[PDB]
Design a protein around this ligand. Structure first.
Ligand SMILES: NC(=O)c1ccc[n+]([C@@H]2O[C@H](COP(=O)([O-])OP(=O)(O)OC[C@H]3O[C@@H](n4cnc5c(N)ncnc54)[C@H](OP(=O)(O)O)[C@@H]3O)[C@@H](O)[C@H]2O)c1
Ligand SMILES: NC(=O)c1ccc[n+]([C@@H]2O[C@H](COP(=O)([O-])OP(=O)(O)OC[C@H]3O[C@@H](n4cnc5c(N)ncnc54)[C@H](OP(=O)(O)O)[C@@H]3O)[C@@H](O)[C@H]2O)c1
Ligand SMILES: NC(=O)c1ccc[n+]([C@@H]2O[C@H](COP(=O)([O-])OP(=O)(O)OC[C@H]3O[C@@H](n4cnc5c(N)ncnc54)[C@H](OP(=O)(O)O)[C@@H]3O)[C@@H](O)[C@H]2O)c1
Ligand SMILES: NC(=O)c1ccc[n+]([C@@H]2O[C@H](COP(=O)([O-])OP(=O)(O)OC[C@H]3O[C@@H](n4cnc5c(N)ncnc54)[C@H](OP(=O)(O)O)[C@@H]3O)[C@@H](O)[C@H]2O)c1
Lengths: 102, 325, 102, 325, 102, 102, 325, 325
């Protein structure tokens, strides 16, 4: 709820409440056992050495509640390998490709 | 190994600690209190836990005269204290900056020490910000009154809140956690505590391994004289044993008599080595009222190689209270 | 005037003077009673767990004095639900749709 | 409840405090000063406010000798002091780093204390940066000379500027605010202060609830002998009562005699329980010159359940000065 | 030279060496008397409560040595009012419009 | 391995693991003798007073393992002078121009 | 106004200060040193500058015995010291953490003080990082050995470097700067210093307003006996006066005799009020060897209203050395 | 230049230091220990390295009585200590916050010093976080027990980890590094340490330049009596000399006799000036058991201009162990 989780994507910091990420319990950011290995205890943050412009669409997936879409500057090969890492499911991947038309 | 770290911290404590609750300064005499600490310190115990609320501050006085007289190096001991209740005044309770600095300075004059090692917040304070507690705990560490600090009975959300204030303001996070852990109290140390240990590095220093003497099995024939349930002001422990939930627990302890007979151990030695069976629990605070009990409970270290996986599976079928994550 | 207000939009920090936000007193960032519930006392900032690229056009609405326009990478469904949150009015919404052509 | 927190802080103060302005070290003797504090401390008051400017420093000396004579625990008292005027030299005024450290070290030798609880900046200093004040107030807290700090007569922009510097530089923000609040001074504590309390967590410790004795109603027949308006150097209070704006206020106090007659209370008890009617005001600093006045004013806690919503609406129609947000 | 100057554009921080900004002595960022009124001494930075995406093209004007161009997401009315503030001259404005075609 | 290298590109932070940059030992960010002259010891970071949007494509070259591509808002003259600075080779430059079609 | 702030800081100093270089502990006796400070402190001067290098530490001893003998309040004085030279050992020079902490502690035992107000770095140290100097200067302020710190003879780039380390590491920036400023040395305080004052808030405390006695005009007929140019080890001042660049300066001082005759003043009073003519210079460190010189130089405050814009234009045509920005 | 900085720090140490390992408090008497330090301090050596593990703490006692007897200024000396081992208890080892604060406070009572210049972590601690070590080393510097801190035998990843914690938490980074460097141990100081010097500013204070006396050449005819290899408890040094890898080294030292004969020097003077031939090594800790050895080894500064580039190329062909980057 009130607790805010700082997620650091290669030096870019995103801060969101814990009850936003816990809306989707089977993803990598929703399951605390999965994201436990990315925690930086000296900085109190989750560090992902991953693609930087992909994560704003991954973050707004949790905030809007399931409305993800590809950013305009991120290609389809890069962004589809980010949905598989962040584990947004076999279900929200099919809604992604139909919007895409693939 | 008998000595183990306290959390991720560098503080090496023994796997059994001695507590000054009820016995010291209360139940037993000053001469028996001198004899129990010499028996504990000669068996390798360096962890000696006290509080300012115990015996209205008289328990720290007894502990304080034992370290001066014996002449035990302060370097070889780990003295811990707890600060929540100072007295009757409204400013003498809580985890405010006024009481953490005053109550620890008051405890260091009864213990006759220059510093304690770990100061504990004895319970959480809803009427104080967490910034004020973490700044006051950092203050008494930088003044040199304490080396470490921990929390007692704090929800793992309150521990994670106190951790996030210390990283925000460049303060000192707690290293430890005292939680009740015996065979009849398993929810915090097996579910909540393990998550904290791998994330931020907080260990558990579990207290009451025999549940104030219940799991020793002495209360199966009623209330024996000169035990803790018959002391003055402990009607809450007599109401706990004689109630129908407490009569059911004694029916489980007779089933544990057979498992303790299959090993060489007794039932207090079984109930302590069961608490040390995991890597998450960093220490166990004993309680002992005479020299036969303390010599018995230090015999629970050698029972810890005897516990296999199968005996742990066998006890949990008798207990019937294993928590689910 | 001199006082600067730090507004944190999901980890992205925008700092502006107080006399810029107080130019428009009926919005969420202009009325101190409305934005009181978003204040983070420990960090001395206003935290909004909202869309990140939408707020640069919302911030430049106050700086330019009423000239808002949609960013090129923010769609019309996302950005119109941000003007309703930040409460820029029924009046600056109609000037938005006419530029838009809606 | 009689004890309440000071802001959001953990410091629990009583809802009535005793101030050493004029009466202590000045107007009344040392023996009456010993009798008023024993009457206050036995009624649950723990808040005792003084300053270094009062009686050229003699008011802290009288307070200092009472705590040593009565043998009160320092833990049970909340002693507060105010630091702006130290003397005649140019370096002995202001909120500079030189004067905050010297003036508090000078006050701790007259009070004979090791620490005060809340040190107050007695008024704002335009010739000093806010960084220098907040660093010097943080310094005397980390040295252990004070626990908390607050501000007196600082506008809410100056309090919000001070708060911002403390978060910028990882310093300690103020917890409190002393503002004048009686029936004839309502603008700061009802409009400006409430906003601060919910935002950053600053409470108000309001002083002069009877407006230096005016709202007690004793000045309706002119200037009585041996009251504060007849003392030496207090012509500003006689000019305030006898002026045409001050003669109009006494015409309102006769209309408040009827409301105080409908309740069981008197007019000083009404004028204090009116100040405690909100959750924003954390304490009220009384002033008392004898034992009948202090026993009367501590009877204003009983009048606080008697104030309904309707009597608050009735008094504000008589006063006619309710501020608008 | 070695010294680095932190310029804060509405919460976005740009750090550059002092010998980069001093390459062009008649602009607002090159003349120390002009940029003196924007200095924040408590943070040791220059704070400009101005447009945020315009300044990356203004910063790379000094780094490249005179090669400025309009960003793709910043319109011509917004970006031309930023060149007049940062005082890049009547000379580098004419090279801007010819590239633009204005 | 777990060590993280913070790279500061004109005020924009780009934290990365050391075993990511050490995947390519002959570049400027892979050779510790080459990047030694850019280290800021008071801040514990590598400061480059260079182009800002070019480096996200340079950073993702090391993370993906050799897949670089030009960002959409960075022109071909600007971005090709960044590949020569960061020393990504005569070999990964030819794979860049063929994708480009040059 | 005679008292003015030191930079932007809250430290209020007088516009004329007294320095212990040469005259104290060296040239003049201890009894005359007691008489000059009583003459200065009774005229409102609170600024008394010394150093550890002066008279091999004997100048701080003389100053130290006067404050104890006269019984002056420490609150009313502003004592400043300089810490760059400690002795013959290699570890006794520089601005290292060893010598600042070690050096200041040695000066506080000769001055017999608990603290000085402003400790100065007497010259820059190329063999020390600026982090080590700013951390060591912050250390002696947080220990309470000093209130403020400043720098002497530091290039405005070195002052701006020391400022940017203090904001980086949350340390304490310097408040002051001692720079030589007389009629024949104008480049730093009129060009470099003003920029610093409006940017970061560093004021100037200028020393040698009479250029070691040259601008007093006493050296026009050669070298008078019992002046500073005839003292032992001051051949550098005799080589400065008698050289052809120094003989030209005396030809300008005869042209300044006519301007000092048009006003009521003398030439030392003119040369000091010329240094105070701007708002950037926060103080002027005098030097006086007897009571007629000090009474003459404190009479330069009266000449400061007499300087109009036109006399400032007239002197600068005689001097012919106005710097260009 | 005899005096050189320690890393990038402002601490000026001499190029030769005196160590108290084995000799002081052990091998040689207290009267010879007084004579060696007077011979060293009169030749310009200010660096005197000790530890708490040496002679079970008796080596600091001997050093402590010499500084009090000779009346040396503390300002002229650089005293360094090492804190890894304190005794037999489990809490008396490691780099925990408990042992760094206790072990340094225990060493300052044997040395009879107020403080020490550099405190050295004598070896790395795998059972302690690096945050706890860097916070405890920062703590004893801010309390004034130490000025600087360094590390001993820590790999360059552990030094770079300790540096990145100090910048993260605004703590104090180490300035120094003690690494073994002689003709038969070259890998750390020529490859790993030079990289750290130019990056973060850590210098090397190399110990054992003669490899516990091997490179002096005295062991070529077996084990001479009254040397260190024949002392009690030093069988590890006799096993090192008499082994087949240690017999091969003596065959190289006879080839170095010809190079030491071409210069005026001896083989101990050659083996020390070879260690000072680079700018990375900031000091060399000697060892001396009598006054002929110490007078011989201080004569190695004169041999340092005699080493050209060609003799450095000639020795490395004899040694045959030059590391590759
Ligand atoms: N909030 C907190 O942090 C907190 C709260 C409570 C305690 N603690 C710590 O934990 C310690 C207390 O643990 P505890 O004393 O409550 O439970 P135990 O389970 O530690 O209680 C031991 C007591 O039960 C009886 N007993 C122990 N061993 C026995 C044996 N082998 N045979 C027969 N009887 C035996 C003893 O004699 P009697 O039966 O005659 O008494 C003894 O006084 C204290 O020292 C305290 O420091 C901490
Ligand atoms: N700037 C600041 O922070 C500030 C400034 C001023 C005061 N304060 C605090 O507030 C306190 C003073 O409040 P105050 O004394 O100025 O106003 P009150 O309203 O607190 O003044 C009380 C004085 O008025 C008279 N009085 C009180 N109760 C009475 C009663 N029931 N019947 C008849 N007369 C009564 C008393 O006798 P007399 O009429 O004979 O005097 C008494 O001396 C001080 O102790 C001080 O610590 C703070
Ligand atoms: N690096 C630094 O920070 C630094 C360096 C130097 C000085 N200072 C400070 O500045 C102060 C010294 O200033 P200063 O003494 O060098 O130059 P002044 O210009 O301050 O020198 C005054 C000296 O010149 C002569 N003099 C002064 N007034 C006179 C008058 N009205 N008539 C005739 N002779 C007069 C005096 O007698 P005599 O001619 O017989 O000597 C006196 O000893 C020191 O106290 C020191 O604290 C600081
Ligand atoms: N971990 C650490 O930080 C660490 C570890 C070890 C030492 N250290 C420091 O380094 C110092 C020790 O260096 P070291 O003593 O081990 O190696 P050296 O190379 O410093 O050893 C000198 C010893 O070898 C012999 N020797 C020296 N010069 C000689 C000469 N000219 N001719 C003949 N024999 C000579 C001496 O007599 P003998 O042969 O009769 O003994 C002497 O006792 C200690 O004082 C200690 O403080 C630090």
């Amino acid at each position: 709820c009130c607790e805010r989780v700082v997620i650091n994507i290669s030096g870019l910091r995103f801060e969101t409440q814990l009850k936003t990420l816990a809306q989707f319990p089977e993803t990598l950011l929703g399951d605390p056992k999965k994201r436990m290995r990315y925690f930086d205890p000296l900085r109190n943050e989750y560090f992902f050495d991953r693609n930087r412009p992909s994560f704003d669409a991954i973050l707004y997936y949790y905030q809007s509640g399931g409305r993800l879409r590809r950013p305009v500057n991120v290609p389809l090969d890069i962004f589809s390998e980010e949905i598989r890492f962040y584990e947004l499911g076999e279900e929200a991947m099919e809604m992604f490709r139909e919007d895409e038309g693939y | 190994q008998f000595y183990r770290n306290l959390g991720k911290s560098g503080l090496r404590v023994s796997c059994l600690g001695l507590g000054t609750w009820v016995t010291f300064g209360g139940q037993i005499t000053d001469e028996m209190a001198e004899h129990l600490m010499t028996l504990a310190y000669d068996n390798g115990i360096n962890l000696f836990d006290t509080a300012e609320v115990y015996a209205a501050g008289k328990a720290e006085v007894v502990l304080g005269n034992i370290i001066k007289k014996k002449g035990w190096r302060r370097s070889s001991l780990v003295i811990t204290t707890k600060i929540f209740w100072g007295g009757k005044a409204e400013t003498e309770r809580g985890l405010s900056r006024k009481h953490i600095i005053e109550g620890l300075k008051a405890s260091l004059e009864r213990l006759q020490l220059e510093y304690v090692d770990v100061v504990f917040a004895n319970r959480p304070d809803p009427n104080t910000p967490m910034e004020e507690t973490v700044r006051a705990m950092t203050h008494v560490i930088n003044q040199g009154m304490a080396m470490y600090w921990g929390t007692s009975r704090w929800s793992s959300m309150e521990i994670m809140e106190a951790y996030s204030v210390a990283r925000q303001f460049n303060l000192i996070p707690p290293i430890c956690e005292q939680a009740e852990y015996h065979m009849f109290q398993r929810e915090k140390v097996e579910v909540q505590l393990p998550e904290l240990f791998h994330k931020i590095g907080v260990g558990a220093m579990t207290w009451s391994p025999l549940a104030c003497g219940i799991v020793s099995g002495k209360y199966d024939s009623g209330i024996p004289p000169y035990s803790r349930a018959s002391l003055k002001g402990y009607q809450w422990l007599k109401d706990k044993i004689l109630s129908e939930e407490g009569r059911r627990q004694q029916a489980k302890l007779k089933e544990l008599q057979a498992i303790a007979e299959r090993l060489g151990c007794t039932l207090p030695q079984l109930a302590i080595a069961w608490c040390l069976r995991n890597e998450g629990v960093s220490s166990v605070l004993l309680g002992a009222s005479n020299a036969e009990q303390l010599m018995e409970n230090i015999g629970a270290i050698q029972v810890l190689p005897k516990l296999s996986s199968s005996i742990v599976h066998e006890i949990d079928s008798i207990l019937g209270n294993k928590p689910y994550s």
